Amino acid sequence: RVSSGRDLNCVPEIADTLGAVAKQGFDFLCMPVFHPRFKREFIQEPAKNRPGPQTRSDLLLSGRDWNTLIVGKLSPWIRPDSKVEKIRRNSEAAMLQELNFGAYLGLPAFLLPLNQEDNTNLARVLTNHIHTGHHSSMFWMRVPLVAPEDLRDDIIENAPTTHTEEYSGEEKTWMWWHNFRTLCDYSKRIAVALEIGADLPSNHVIDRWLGEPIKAAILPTSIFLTNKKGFPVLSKMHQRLIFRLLKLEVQFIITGTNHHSEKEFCSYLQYLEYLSQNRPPPNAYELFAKGYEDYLQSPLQPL
């Protein structure tokens, strides 16, 4: 048995949506806090003065349901490191706004993408947030195993995908995150939500996220294979990964639409439970060493 959430980017009714997913078996929900498309303006008139409400009301769920069931997502239009000054400024303000809102709601965690090399300003806005007021919320960075650019189909005739290997280039993504948490000065409130893809990278660059503060793994529906009886499964190698990630007691996150209408979402989830059930079983040492992991003791003054 594992803890796992749904990742949605569309929620017409928050009550109904939550019910659906919990009835499907999920532990929690990743959803937006403001409408993903609801670009807001903060400086120039008249848009600046747009009549409200800016978003949904808190009253739509119990405090308990907020604290325990909902993971926030940053709006996708928010680009603090844009090269366009005006965009940069609205993104700053908007990011602050969506962040203070998550904190106002007391969400247990909030998601933010690292989908490019440069996140200096995103990092600086977030650090600035962490050192303002008091809240305990976790920040999850959505970083992918393989950069979006290195995943694209080789289908631009005049811009081929540079065919033979770069040892560094398969690692660029870890450096996105490395640099990010170094600037944020290893805050303990900033962890990783690693996105798994269809094509796993070279085994080394998977090694790379050994030791890092992974708190979740995002599996898109589109990477599941399909068995003799139309059910969703994973490649042999993708299973190696799950088993490893299970040891870290990460939470799993299913994202994207269903690509097998022949059954519910609960089938993807069902499979995961199956893998947890069928892990290389806990031994004498491992059962004993359980509530002790990464716990630092000073040794004794033996004398």
């Binding site: 409200g52 409400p53 978003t55 808190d58 405090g63 706004q97 809102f101 904190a103 106002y104 809240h135």
Partner: protein
């Protein structure tokens, strides 16, 4: 400087007395202001200052349909996060009887003057959330004959003995700051394992509106407490009283406590060093309310039976941001 979280509003909104008491205050005031024959001719303009998730607004609506009188509402609120709840309430329910304003009340340019302003901006020591400053900054848009609710509040102090609490404050030393800062700021606390050495006495009072020629919110006050037991002083419990309208009040002063109101605990003012007091003696203490343009703070000392250090000089250990 900070914004209240959704769950905070949630918990306090459930108070069984604070809200009905306000409804009753607006009710009384409406009548005293529009006479029976004028009832449909006169629409009182009512401004709620710090409207939160809207319970004072609702309670105003409930007051008007109890006085059977007519009102125009503004709901001013600084917290943009709460302003979200409000703006949702006003579209789903209230309608354009309520105008929701998302700004600070010191800042808002009001389209019109008010008949009555309304606020609950009080802390356990009455004026420790800068309600003086806020209502002073808002009063220029109150009609010349305008009522404020509340009309006044008054703080109080009583000396206490408690090793238990003295030890809890002590335990509040943090790295990277004065090793004695714990002692120079007031704690909101449910006072339990303690002894009250003398009856509470009034400390600071503020009236609203302030028809004061030139307004000054700073204060200095001296209190003498008769002590008739031997003991050791570890600090002062503060409490407060407030007049909403006429006889309708709220209080956390134990001798007049409002039955069932859980919305405020008392405050604690500690002292750096405990002071022995002989049966028969008088405790003299002193409090100052201080300010500049940026922040307001308290500073205090005991002058009898011995002196303490003047506590918190300059707001060096704590201030409240303006």
């Amino acid at each position: 400087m900070d914004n209240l979280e959704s769950q905070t509003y949630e918990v306090f909104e459930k108070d069984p007395i604070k809200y009905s008491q306000y409804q009753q205050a607006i009710y009384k005031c409406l009548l005293d202001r529009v006479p029976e024959e004028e009832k449909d001719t006169n629409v009182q303009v009512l401004m709620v200052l710090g409207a939160g998730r809207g319970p004072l607004v609702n309670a105003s609506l409930r007051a008007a349909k109890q006085a059977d009188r007519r009102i125009k509402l503004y709901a001013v609120e600084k917290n943009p996060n709460a302003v979200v709840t409000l703006e949702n309430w006003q579209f789903e329910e209230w309608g354009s009887q309520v105008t929701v304003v998302s700004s600070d009340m010191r800042e808002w340019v009001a389209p019109e003057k008010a008949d009555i302003i309304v606020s609950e901006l009080l802390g356990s020591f009455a004026d420790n959330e800068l309600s003086p400053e806020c209502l002073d900054g808002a009063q220029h848009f109150l009609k010349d004959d305008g009522v404020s609710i509340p009309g006044e509040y008054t703080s109080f102090l009583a000396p206490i003995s408690s090793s238990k609490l003295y030890n809890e404050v002590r335990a509040c030393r943090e790295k990277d700051r004065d090793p004695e800062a714990q002692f120079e700021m007031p704690y909101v606390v449910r006072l339990h394992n303690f002894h009250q050495l003398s009856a509470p006495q009034p400390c600071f009072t503020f009236s609203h509106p302030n028809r004061d020629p030139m307004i000054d919110n700073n204060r200095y006050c001296t209190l003498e407490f008769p002590v008739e037991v031997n003991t050791v002083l570890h600090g002062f419990a503060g409490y407060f009283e407030t007049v909403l309208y006429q006889d309708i009040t709220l209080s956390i002063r134990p001798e007049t406590h409002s039955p069932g109101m859980f919305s405020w605990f008392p405050i604690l003012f500690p002292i750096k060093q405990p002071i022995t007091v002989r049966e028969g003696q008088t405790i003299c203490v002193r409090f100052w309310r201080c300010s500049n343009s940026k922040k307001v703070w308290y500073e205090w000392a005991v002058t009898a039976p011995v002196c303490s250090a003047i506590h918190n000089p300059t707001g060096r250990s704590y201030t409240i941001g303006l």
